[PDB]
Paper text:
In this work, we demonstrate these properties using a 9°N DNA polymerase. We show that 3′-esterified dNTP can be incorporated into a template-primer DNA by using MS analysis and X-ray crystallography to validate reaction intermediates and products. We further used structural analyses to examine the incorporation of 3′-NL into DNA.
Residue numbers in the entry: 1 to 754
Write the structure that this text describes.
DNA sequence: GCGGACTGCTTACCG
DNA sequence: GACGGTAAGCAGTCCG
């Protein structure tokens, strides 16, 4: 299985490296054959040799075009003949391009911004992580003596924990007398040992939880300060800390550095992303957190380093268990997209789509359109109409049937051949015209994107069939990950059209998708209301809730099933409506906010404060208990009482602190903010202490007693101590518990609760 | 003047 | 880190 690709420079010539593992042995295949290239559309082929003599200096010396060949290749379907300009070293590409482009003979420079290592994987048609081979993995974690506002790295590492299938152990230089602790003599000697342990085990994968930003960077700062050759690589390389986007990312050449944080963040939706939370979330089993204040006084005292140790050991043990559960699906991802597990792990669905197209485009002889310049993105800053959301018939309704379209936007993208290479073509035999946008899509050639979208959905059914046949539970799991991933990639294509920084951007494509969406949703609703006697209670894009007021639950079911038989033949192409659920009773509050309870008794909650992370857990609990009473039981008085007891408990100061924590994410650099919410006021005072309040950072806080602006009275949950502080018993009753509860119980017009 | 009515910023959800 | 549509709360500024 091809792990990843890289290139070194042997005697001033770029030699490619394909890191593979064949028959339970890591092998490195070199390739000097592959020469870099980039395309160029000259105004007149006559000016080939004239424009071929452009140059500019690199670090070593001057760079000039090695050779050039005029090539025929399709662009948005339309045939085009352009010059591909070969260069000796890939780092000559970024030097020559700007000047070669400015040349008043060439029209534009194309396909110049693809890395060579990634170019090789595409052009050769080599698929990463293909074939059956069990890869050895080692999870590791570090514990540091980082002070309050201490310059990053000055604090020394106290312990290094590593864990795999066999064992979990701690290496440290203070004396923790336990069977899983290895006492070294100095910090230097423990790092020396850790590096040796990694060398001895020689694992294919190194698992971390946010190792990209903290763990690896910190080990470097120390290895510099102490003077240790930080060689974790298989080729004897020190780990490469690249500045990928807002954050950084770290590559251990020869191994897979699998940072769980970015993957877990993308996958799971949690209030906070502590390794304690991620564990308790995924596995359900709890994990205690030995703090920095504790880890410090432990080291300073010597008393009770056994807890500080157990923590470090459990951190690695958990990291391993999380890694072994997440890695497999992130591997099948690598296969589907066709780039390394490393990239696919740290990539947006936005870029995963573009990588998947760049690959298919090469195979189709399609020249890839360039990413937009700064002036272009400004021109793509024009929004478009979304989908229909019906203003809901409010109240408690009985016997609701949920109907929705199966893969709506994809069905449209396929059916109407929606693609930039088909948008308003010249003299096609057949066209499909968008309802209100008016955009006409050529229906002669199967479009680039639709063609691929078909194959994906076409393969997903092949995989779901092979799953039925699969006897091995492991393969049936790995097969489910593939089929599942295909779907999520298939539903990303509408979004990619609207995404400005996308190569294959198309505003009129995205506009037309939503438009057809609006028409078909509205047309279904109209029929179910007219032809059949249903009353559409609420509807969002692609889905609706309805019932037959006064009819029995059985009748609602039968009649809804009868409607699907009627409507589907009337609908065109792949546009098909499906019966998705029936619910005993349901409650619609506002647009995007409602709840329903199924026949078995499982309540389903959408949009209400219960699900939101930026509400006090007392408000989210108090609501869920009121909502349970109204739906599950039916005791409206019980809800009235549930509010009052909870309300009195807070005013008596008997409400636990833990339940009062409010979580609000920091969107941008705190300076850029135009108006200060509490979370901003919390973030700005925390940053004044030299803390790292950066984009992605979730701010926890509690409202302290008093009056005025809520933001000037917010002490972080960690910072908060009971003392004589207490809490703003008013706020949590006035602004949190009551408003949220009121939303549900307002249907029966309740005024005030004690 | 004062304080109730408006309005823009920001967050997190829904599909 | 895709998309647009939506409900809110909090902290400012009108204007009768
Ligand atoms: Ca020009
Ligand atoms: Ca539903
Ligand atoms: Ca099904
Ligand atoms: Ca019941
Ligand atoms: Ca948006």
């Amino acid at each position: 299985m091809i792990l990843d690709t890289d290139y070194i420079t042997e005697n001033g010539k770029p030699v490619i490296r394909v890191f593979k593992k064949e028959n339970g042995e890591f092998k490195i295949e070199y390739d000097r054959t592959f020469e870099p290239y980039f395309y160029a559309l000259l105004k007149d082929d006559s000016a080939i040799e004239d424009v071929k003599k452009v140059t500019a200096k690199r670090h070593g010396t001057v760079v000039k075009v090695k050779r050039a060949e005029k090539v025929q290749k399709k662009f948005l379907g339309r045939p085009i003949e352009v010059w591909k300009l070969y260069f000796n070293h890939p780092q000559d590409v970024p030097a020559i391009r700007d000047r070669i482009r400015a040349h008043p003979a060439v029209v534009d420079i194309y396909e110049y911004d693809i890395p060579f290592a990634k170019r090789y994987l595409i052009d050769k048609g080599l698929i990463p992580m293909e074939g059956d081979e069990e890869l050895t993995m080692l999870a590791f974690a570090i514990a540091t003596l980082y002070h309050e506002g201490e310059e990053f790295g000055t604090g020394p590492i106290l312990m290094i924990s590593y864990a795999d299938g066999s064992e979990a152990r701690v290496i440290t230089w203070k004396k923790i007398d336990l069977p899983y602790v290895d006492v070294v003599s100095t910090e230097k000697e423990m790092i020396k040992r850790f590096l040796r342990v990694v060398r001895e085990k020689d694992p294919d994968v190194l698992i971390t939880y946010n190792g990209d930003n903290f763990d690896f960077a910190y080990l470097k700062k120390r290895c510099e300060e102490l003077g240790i050759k930080f060689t974790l690589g298989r080729d004897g390389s020190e780990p490469k800390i690249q500045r990928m986007g807002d954050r950084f990312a770290v590559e251990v050449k020869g191994r897979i550095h699998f940072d769980l944080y970015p993957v877990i963040r993308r996958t799971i939706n949690l209030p906070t992303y502590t390794l304690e939370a991620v564990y308790e979330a995924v596995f359900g089993k709890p994990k205690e957190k030995v703090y920095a204040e504790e880890i410090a006084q432990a080291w300073e005292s010597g008393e009770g380093l056994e807890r500080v140790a157990r923590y470090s050991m459990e951190d690695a043990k958990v990291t391993y268990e999380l890694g072994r559960e997440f890695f497999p699906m992130e591997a099948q991802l690598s296969r589907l997209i066709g780039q390394s597990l490393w990239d696919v792990s740290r990539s947006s669905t936005g870029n995963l789509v573009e990588w998947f197209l760049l690959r298919k485009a090469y195979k189709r002889n399609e020249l890839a359109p360039n990413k937009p310049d700064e002036r272009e993105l400004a021109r793509r800053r024009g929004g478009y109409a979304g989908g229909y959301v019906k203003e809901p018939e409010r109240g408690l309704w009985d016997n609701i049937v949920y109907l929705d379209f199966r893969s709506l936007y994809p069905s449209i993208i396929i059916t109407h051949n929606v693609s930039p290479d088909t948008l308003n073509r010249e003299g096609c035999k057949e066209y499909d015209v968008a309802p209100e946008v008016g955009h006409k899509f050529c229906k002669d050639f199967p479009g680039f994107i639709p063609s691929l979208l078909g194959d994906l959905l076409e393969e997903r059914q092949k995989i779901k069939r092979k799953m039925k046949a699969t006897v091995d539970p492991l393969e049936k799991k790995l097969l489910d990950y593939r089929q599942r991933l295909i779907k999520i990639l298939a539903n990303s294509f509408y979004g990619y059209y609207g995404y400005a920084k996308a190569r294959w951007y198309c505003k009129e494509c995205a506009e037309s998708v939503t438009a057809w969406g609006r028409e078909y949703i509205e047309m279904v609703i109209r029929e179910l209301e007219e032809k059949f006697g249903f009353k559409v209670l609420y509807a969002d894009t692609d889905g609706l809730h309805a019932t037959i007021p006064g009819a029995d639950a059985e009748t609602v079911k039968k009649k809804a099933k009868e409607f699907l038989k009627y409507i589907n033949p009337k609908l065109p192409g792949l546009l098909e409506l499906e019966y998705e659920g029936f619910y005993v009773r349901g409650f619609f509050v506002t647009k995007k906010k409602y709840a329903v309870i199924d026949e078995e008794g499982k309540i389903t909650t959408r949009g209400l404060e219960i699900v939101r992370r930026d509400w006090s857990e007392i408000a989210k609990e108090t609501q869920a208990r009121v909502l349970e009473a109204i739906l599950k039981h039916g005791d409206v008085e019980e809800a009235v009482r549930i509010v009052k007891e909870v309300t009195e408990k807070l005013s008596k100061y008997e409400v636990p602190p833990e339940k009062l924590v409010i979580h609000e994410q920091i969107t941008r650099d705190l300076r850029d903010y135009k108006a200060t919410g509490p979370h901003v006021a919390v973030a700005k005072r925390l940053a004044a202490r030299g803390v790292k309040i950066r984009p992605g950072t979730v701010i926890s806080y509690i409202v302290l007693k008093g009056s005025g602006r809520i933001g000037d009275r917010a002490i972080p949950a960690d910072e908060f101590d009971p003392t004589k502080h207490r809490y703003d018993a008013e706020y949590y009753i006035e602004n949190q518990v009551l408003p949220a509860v009121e939303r549900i119980l307002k249907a029966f017009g309740y005024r005030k609760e004690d």
